[PDB]
């Protein structure tokens, strides 16, 4: 009986989950636009993959509360990022990154839904902006004062004038989580059951599409087989994904079942027809509209470099060359103990663009999907703590 792995105060599996001892390394990759005016004239874009930007992460758990005689647990999962310099190319507070301007493409979206229409259309007209800007790395990723968003703030005081890709994510949580420990059964261990009081999602089409499955992805339940299907709900992708078996791997000196995120998460299936909002008209295979769960920002979540996606988007951007080894998402799990050995979460943040005649900053741009950034969040178990798990 492997009841040793539970979330009980007095166990060493709860100590690993409250405070994760193994560091998490995230490398931020960017896309640099080489011909920015020619995209406004209507030519094919040409980009450049720029990195690596190694951040070392920090993890803990706060507000841990028990209940229902020990089987239900609810806590928050904070996440703080600390940059590492020797594992990165250059100093990020000087490194200028030229890309799209996401706030001025956000507020064009707000004019399309009549959310502050004549206020925003007076901003971009009298204050002429740029579709393509150039800021530093720490500005574009950790908050920067936008021109137009500082003007919406005096009309609407709820809008934050600072935009960032991961703004207010240093030392803050991504929801009030509640889990299910393995005091009742070892099939459902630390499984997400509700989210901020709400049972499941509410913005998708069908009630099958709303269902949150599985865990957050920090550690799984043990006794993993080859034929079962594991389910993962990250808070960034805004649905629950699954993972399929890939091959036989060898982590140091322990068993491993390599599971990878398949193409059928975002494929063109009859199940995934209901994840294109509103009426199932999809932009393509492998992409996902996530504009609801980013407070109105026109963001697309997809694999890096359109991997396992449509080819007519690959030929639209010069520099998209996806392959298996470099731009997938995988996880190494110990099949006997469920401790994640070596994972790599790689997802691309894209910004949708289209030529609209009421905004004369878009030029003559083609309707397409544009590359902005992606990142490899990697976790890894070192030599000493691998030999601690070789005994059990």
């Amino acid at each position: 009986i492997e009841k040793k792995i539970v979330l009980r105060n007095g166990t060493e599996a709860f100590d690993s989950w409250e405070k994760p001892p193994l560091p998490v390394y995230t490398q931020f990759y960017f896309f640099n636009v080489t011909n920015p005016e020619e995209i406004l004239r209507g030519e094919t874009p040409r980009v450049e993959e720029v990195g690596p930007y190694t951040y070392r992460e920090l993890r803990n758990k706060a507000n841990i509360q028990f209940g229902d005689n020990g089987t239900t647990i609810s806590a928050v999962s904070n996440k703080a990022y600390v940059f590492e310099r020797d594992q990165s190319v250059g100093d990020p507070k000087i490194d200028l990154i030229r890309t799209l301007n996401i706030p001025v493409l956000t507020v064009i979206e707000w004019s399309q839904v009549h959310f502050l229409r004549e206020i925003i259309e007076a901003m971009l007209k009298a204050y002429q902006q740029k579709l393509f800007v150039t800021h530093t790395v720490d500005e574009l990723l950790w908050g920067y004062k936008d021109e137009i968003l500082s003007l919406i703030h005096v009309f609407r005081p709820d809008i934050s004038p600072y935009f960032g890709l991961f703004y207010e994510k240093n030392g803050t949580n991504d929801g009030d989580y509640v889990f299910l420990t393995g005091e009742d059964s070892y099939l459902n261990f630390t499984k997400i059951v509700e989210w901020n009081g709400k049972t499941s999602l509410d913005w998708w089409i069908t009630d099958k599409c709303n269902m949150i499955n599985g865990t957050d992805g920090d550690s799984f339940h043990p006794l993993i087989t080859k034929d079962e299907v594991l389910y993962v709900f990250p808070s960034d992708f805004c649905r629950s994904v699954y993972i399929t078996f890939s091959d036989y791997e060898s982590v140091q000196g322990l068993p491993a079942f390599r599971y990878k995120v398949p193409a059928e998460i975002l494929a063109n299936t009859s199940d995934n027809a209901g994840f294109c909002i509103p009426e199932g008209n999809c932009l393509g295979s492998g992409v996902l509209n996530v504009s609801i769960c980013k407070n109105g920002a026109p963001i697309i979540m997809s694999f890096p470099h359109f991997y396992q996606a449509d080819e007519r988007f690959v030929s639209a951007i010069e520099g998209m060359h996806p392959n298996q080894e470099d731009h997938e998402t995988f996880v190494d799990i110990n099949p006997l103990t469920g401790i994640i050995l070596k994972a790599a979460k790689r997802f691309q943040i894209n910004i949708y663009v289209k030529k609209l005649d009421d905004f004369v900053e878009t030029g003559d741009i083609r309707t397409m999907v544009f590359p902005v950034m992606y990142l490899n969040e990697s976790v890894h178990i070192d030599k000493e703590t691998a030999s601690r798990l070789k005994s059990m």
């Binding site: 004549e118 206020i119 901003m123 009298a126 703030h153 005096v154 009309f155 005081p157 709820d158």
Partner: protein
């Protein structure tokens, strides 16, 4: 003999055959600066035809849920025509205005507007919502230009003053059962006899629907509001190169 009018000045005339009456703001016509008042010692330019024209500026659509609009004068005309060229070359400026706002509708539509002037219409903000952060309005809310700007809280006119007593200032109503236009002749009101045309905006034209538009479905749902204005007795001074702002 009051419903039908014609306002010709410059080379541009406008006819109206369902007017109310012309009101002259504060009981006096716009006039030139006398030598009792003038302090600048260079001879002013007075174009007298090329800038005293009815400039038709923009067209605001008025639906059933509108709030109200405002135009800061004379910054609606510092981008337009020979007025916008003389006001950018010359530092000093004075003029009156003949302000004519058209809004026609059928004999089944209803609703009333309060097109009113008010001098030195300064704009406040919502002070960060709760009222503790000293936020100043942006340059486009301050001086929107010929595009106009829509009021956020028309009950307080974005300045903490109620619209219920806006009727003190020179105004007249456009209710669609009686009239379709509203002429307001405004003199030059300012302390000092000339001023800059790019910084100081002497007054603002508040156009607010008080009684809302209403019509049964089947009638024409597009009811525009176009304002035309004419600088009367305009004169400029202090010639230098072109500033735009």
């Amino acid at each position: 003999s009051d419903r039908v009018a014609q306002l010709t000045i410059g080379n541009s005339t406008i006819t109206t055959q369902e007017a109310a009456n012309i009101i002259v703001g504060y009981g006096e016509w716009p006039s030139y600066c006398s030598d009792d008042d003038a302090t600048a010692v260079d001879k002013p330019t007075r174009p007298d035809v090329s800038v005293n024209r009815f400039y038709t500026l923009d067209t605001k659509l008025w639906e059933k849920s509108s709030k109200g609009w405002y135009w800061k004068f004379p910054d609606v005309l510092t981008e337009t025509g020979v007025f916008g060229q003389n006001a950018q070359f010359h530092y000093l400026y004075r003029s009156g205005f003949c302000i004519h706002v058209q809004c026609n509708a059928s004999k089944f539509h209803q609703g009333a507007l309060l097109v009113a002037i008010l001098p030195e219409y300064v704009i406040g903000t919502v002070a960060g919502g709760t009222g503790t952060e000293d936020s100043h309005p942006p340059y486009i809310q301050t001086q929107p230009g010929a595009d106009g700007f829509e009021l956020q809280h028309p009950y307080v006119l974005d300045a903490g003053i109620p619209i219920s007593q806006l009727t003190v200032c020179p105004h007249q109503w456009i209710n669609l059962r009686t009239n379709n236009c509203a002429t307001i002749i405004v003199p030059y009101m300012n302390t000092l006899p000339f001023d800059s045309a790019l910084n100081h905006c002497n007054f603002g034209l508040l156009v607010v629907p008080i009684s809302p538009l209403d019509f049964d479905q089947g009638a024409t749902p597009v009811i525009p509001i176009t304002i035309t204005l004419a600088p009367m007795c305009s004169e400029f001074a202090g010639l230098r190169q072109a500033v735009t702002q």
